[PDB]
Amino acid sequence: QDLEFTRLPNGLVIASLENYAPASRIGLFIKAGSRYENSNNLGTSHLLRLASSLTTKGASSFKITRGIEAVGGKLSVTSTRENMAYTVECLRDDVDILMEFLLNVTTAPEFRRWEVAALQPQLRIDKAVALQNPQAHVIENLHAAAYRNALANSLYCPDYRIGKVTPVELHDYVQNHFTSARMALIGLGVSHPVLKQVAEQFLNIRGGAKAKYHGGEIREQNGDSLVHAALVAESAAIGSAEANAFSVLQHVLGAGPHVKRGSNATSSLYQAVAKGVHQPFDVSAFNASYSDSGLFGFYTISQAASAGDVIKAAYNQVKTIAQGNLSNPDVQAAKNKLKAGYLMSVESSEGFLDEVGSQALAAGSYTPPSTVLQQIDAVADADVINAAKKFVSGRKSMAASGNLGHTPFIDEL
Amino acid sequence: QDLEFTRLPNGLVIASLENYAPASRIGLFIKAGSRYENSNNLGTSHLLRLASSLTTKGASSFKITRGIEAVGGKLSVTSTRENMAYTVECLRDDVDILMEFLLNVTTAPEFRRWEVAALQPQLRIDKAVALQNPQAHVIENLHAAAYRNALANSLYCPDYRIGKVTPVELHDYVQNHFTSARMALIGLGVSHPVLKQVAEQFLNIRGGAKAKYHGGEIREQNGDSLVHAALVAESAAIGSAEANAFSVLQHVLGAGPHVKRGSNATSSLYQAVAKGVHQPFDVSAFNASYSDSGLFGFYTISQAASAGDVIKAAYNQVKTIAQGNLSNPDVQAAKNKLKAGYLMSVESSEGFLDEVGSQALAAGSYTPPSTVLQQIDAVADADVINAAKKFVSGRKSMAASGNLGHTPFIDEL
Amino acid sequence: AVPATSESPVLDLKRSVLCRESLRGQAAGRPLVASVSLNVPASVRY
Amino acid sequence: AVPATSESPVLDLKRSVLCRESLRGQAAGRPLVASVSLNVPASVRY
Amino acid sequence: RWLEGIRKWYYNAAGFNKLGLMRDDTIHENDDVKEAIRRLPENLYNDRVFRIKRALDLSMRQQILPKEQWTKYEEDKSYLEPYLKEVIRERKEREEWAK
């Protein structure tokens, strides 16, 4: 069985593979990520992510919870910087029950004053939890450092706005962003014709700047014995061919582990850093890629005293790749990793749904896995060296968290 | 009556004017400001400032409070980035009682584990209060942006360190910084010979890097309808002749108000900004000057939407002063302000003590007011234009707090 | 339906790292993702 | 001995500004100073 | 319709209007009403608070307002209805679901 695809005259995408599995995943993907906040409504999308299961027009707050739980189902809301994704799972017989709830949640939420206000403390709980990961500190700062406006926005609501996201703001955000022109309705274990008909009858809702890279640095001084740090330069927009080159460069340098408790013998960065410094550490290439822009670099985790040595060692490794020290066996291995990584990411029906929806928003239609692998192979050794060269000469953005006494500045590097 | 002066072989300065007033102020000035913290003991000097009146060797925590209050006295601790100043006031008959307490507080504090721990929450109270002033946010950020290390330190203890400043750290800070080579003992309404003898017998205590300017920017997004903002470049070290030029330039541009509810007709900046934008605002030249370095620029307070216009208007005004648009009547008026401002600052016996002690640390001895005025007059029109030129072409540091949607970046200016 | 890989508490001291072998995997390689749910515990991604 | 120019509370909403005439004086012109005492309320300076 | 004559009579006989109360101020606070009150916007709540304060103060003195100040029958808005109706409608849904 293979995927079906429709783009309606109103802009909306329907894509669905009927695979006759017992479970059915449906996802409504919306261009409504953190990037579409401005300085007046910061953290609105964060509250909105928490806010499904508040009362809707066709269903109460109570009914959304009880009705979904009744059939053993799940309703999740997932945000990137660029998209929001509302996902429902269940046993196939109850899809149109979950669908009714999903439509209510996305197309007619009431955002009642007392309910919206009751939800305010949840912003602090959710944020507090997320910011237990030091990766969350650094990546959120990194973007804030790297951009002037859209992508600079954090996924988590700024402290000052907690308790202050209004019902109006939630209504405005939905009314302005949750529209046919910005929506893709994706599904598994459900027929395409019935999805199309739902999208025509219940998801026909009428419509409602570019990310400026800056280059800055943000430094969280906090006295941990470990220093998390990330250094990136402007990369390439997703959809462009150059982006593929960065993805290969990421895997040349080393993009996370393959063996449990392993020493990463093929990772160019890990070995470059491990040559100089033997104490506990981790280093990885970082590659974000967006509609407008992208960030490529590396992330270090090092001892406080060794942060200087680790970052410089990692940066030096990219410089020699940019200078031209790069053989086919490396670029072949890197491709094999990325090729395997992609097919493995669409291996689960969860990740597959995410890629179908993800593509449908950022691009016109579905690119099959076989065509993607061919496009990875299309990256020549020269393209990888150019990506590295771009990084070396590019205006830098940096972020760190830890005891930064020996963490250098951008202009110290 | 005129001032007396002594510098002992051990480095320590004694200066005292016996003026036969009924009140007597004594100040022990120590090179122990926030700058002498490193990344491991941040906020130690803040706790140390809160920590006088904890138990000493010769007097209990109880006795310091009761004994001083008994004679209607006062004990204050004042910190800049470079110095700490321990000051006692009383009626003349009780000077040697307050002196005994002052010596105990500074030369032998016990910093008992239970007392030091009990004091920890006071860091949050004191900080919280101070940070009610938005000037405190911006100036503390401005320095953190402008410097790599010493002067970058905030006077208020970073959140992560509150509850974590140890007794050892307090002992270390005192032992390493509270020394004869770093101390000046200043006084009014007390004889010089008896001060000298106290300093020889009780203040003979044996001894125990340079500020790198960086140029950065820090942006507090907080949704106020007003935006506080400061933009500075590296100035000149206090003690150097160039510093005097900046002080004159400050008063040419406009350094705060002279008339109540007045429109500041002689302030170059205020009129430059008021030409373009008429809604509520304030603008002033900012001039800090330190042993190693200095910051010169301006501070704006503007409506959120008008922040761009106000900062650019203010910056433009300095550019025309740097280009050469500056007459004698302006430079004469500016000198008259600064000359008057200085003599008025030493008008109170509080401010006089502060200048005697302040000079004694940063320089060798006391410069009389008449010599200072002559040095202000020594600033030529050309020196003012050079200071302005230095600011325009200098690497910039910026800080802001507010709804920064229309506040530009450094590289937008 | 299924509980997450990790139960989340606020105000709970965090798990330590003392070696290379436990610290690898942690260096972030792709941008953040955030999920909240009805059934599954909230968690952020690289 | 003498009480300060302003009594300081924590958790107390701050005083508003609605005009030019009350807002002037506020733009910082010199570096911060911090005093704490036994008798006088803590206050920071430009 | 035809009983509107009696409704208007009863209103004045009942006489809560003489204390400057609206009908919904006189509702006995059960669990639903508590929730309805809790959901009122700042303006409607503070009015309620004052009207009652005023009535209680009058009751304390065993006095009434001037006749001009009495709540007119026609001007008695049913301010609590939309909140209370929904509070009840909600609970009945939970009570249904529980069976």
Curated annotation (Swiss-Prot), chains A, B:
Primary subcellular site in the record, as a coarse category: mitochondrion
Family: Belongs to the peptidase M16 family. UQCRC2/QCR2 subfamily.
Location(s) in or outside the cell: Mitochondrion inner membrane
SUPFAM superfamilies: LuxS/MPP-like metallohydrolase
Topology term for the membrane: Peripheral membrane protein
Gene Ontology CC entries for this record: mitochondrial inner membrane; mitochondrion
Keyword Transit peptide attached: yes
Domain of life of the source: Eukaryota
Keyword annotations: Acetylation, Electron transport, Membrane, Mitochondrion, Mitochondrion inner membrane, Respiratory chain, Transit peptide, Transport
A UniProt-annotated Pfam family: Peptidase_M16
PTM annotation (N6-acetyllysine): residues: 31, 164, 210
Designated name of the protein: Cytochrome b-c1 complex subunit 2, mitochondrial
Subunit description: Component of the ubiquinol-cytochrome c oxidoreductase (cytochrome b-c1 complex, complex III, CIII), a multisubunit enzyme composed of 11 subunits. The complex is composed of 3 respiratory subunits cytochrome b, cytochrome c1 and Rieske protein UQCRFS1, 2 core protein subunits UQCRC1/QCR1 and UQCRC2/QCR2, and 6 low-molecular weight protein subunits UQCRH/QCR6, UQCRB/QCR7, UQCRQ/QCR8, UQCR10/QCR9, UQCR11/QCR10 and subunit 9, the cleavage product of Rieske protein UQCRFS1.
Gene3D superfamilies: Metalloenzyme, LuxS/M16 peptidase-like (3.30.830.10)
Keyword Acetylation among record annotations: yes
PANTHER family named in the record: CYTOCHROME B-C1 COMPLEX SUBUNIT 2, MITOCHONDRIAL, METALLOPROTEASE
One GO molecular-function entry: metal ion binding
Functional note: Component of the ubiquinol-cytochrome c oxidoreductase, a multisubunit transmembrane complex that is part of the mitochondrial electron transport chain which drives oxidative phosphorylation.
Curated annotation (Swiss-Prot), chains C, D:
UniProt subunit comment: Component of the ubiquinol-cytochrome c oxidoreductase (cytochrome b-c1 complex, complex III, CIII). Subunit 9 corresponds to the mitochondrial targeting sequence (MTS) of Rieske protein UQCRFS1. It is retained after processing and incorporated inside complex III, where it remains bound to the complex and localizes between the 2 core subunits UQCRC1/QCR1 and UQCRC2/QCR2.
Task performed by this protein: Component of the ubiquinol-cytochrome c oxidoreductase (cytochrome b-c1 complex, complex III, CIII). UQCRFS1 undergoes proteolytic processing once it is incorporated in the complex III dimer. One of the fragments, called subunit 9, corresponds to its mitochondrial targeting sequence (MTS). The proteolytic processing is necessary for the correct insertion of UQCRFS1 in the complex III dimer, but the persistence of UQCRFS1-derived fragments may prevent newly imported UQCRFS1 to be processed and assembled into complex III and is detrimental for the complex III structure and function.
Name assigned to this protein: Cytochrome b-c1 complex subunit 9
Organism expressing this protein natively: Bos taurus (Bovine)
Shown part of the complete sequence: 33 to 78 of 274
UniProtKB/Swiss-Prot annotation, chain E:
Modification sites for N6-succinyllysine: 67, 77
Predominant location category: mitochondrion
A biological process from GO: mitochondrial electron transport, ubiquinol to cytochrome c
Topology term for the membrane: Peripheral membrane protein
Modified residues annotated as N6-acetyllysine in this record: 8, 67, 72, 77, 85
Keyword rRNA-binding: no
Superkingdom in the source lineage: Eukaryota
Listed InterPro entries: QCR7 (IPR003197), QCR7_sf (IPR036544)
Protein's cellular compartments: Mitochondrion inner membrane
Keyword annotations from UniProtKB, A to Z: Acetylation, Electron transport, Membrane, Mitochondrion, Mitochondrion inner membrane, Respiratory chain, Transport
Disulfide bonds: none
GO cellular component: a single term: mitochondrial inner membrane
Stretches assigned to coiled coil: none
Record flagged with keyword Disulfide bond: no
Subunit structure of this chain's protein: Component of the ubiquinol-cytochrome c oxidoreductase (cytochrome b-c1 complex, complex III, CIII), a multisubunit enzyme composed of 11 subunits. The complex is composed of 3 respiratory subunits cytochrome b, cytochrome c1 and Rieske protein UQCRFS1, 2 core protein subunits UQCRC1/QCR1 and UQCRC2/QCR2, and 6 low-molecular weight protein subunits UQCRH/QCR6, UQCRB/QCR7, UQCRQ/QCR8, UQCR10/QCR9, UQCR11/QCR10 and subunit 9, the cleavage product of Rieske protein UQCRFS1.
PANTHER family named among the record's database cross-references: CYTOCHROME B-C1 COMPLEX SUBUNIT 7, UBIQUINOL-CYTOCHROME C REDUCTASE COMPLEX 14 KD PROTEIN
Similarity remark: Belongs to the UQCRB/QCR7 family.
Role this protein plays: Component of the ubiquinol-cytochrome c oxidoreductase, a multisubunit transmembrane complex that is part of the mitochondrial electron transport chain which drives oxidative phosphorylation.
Name of this protein: Cytochrome b-c1 complex subunit 7
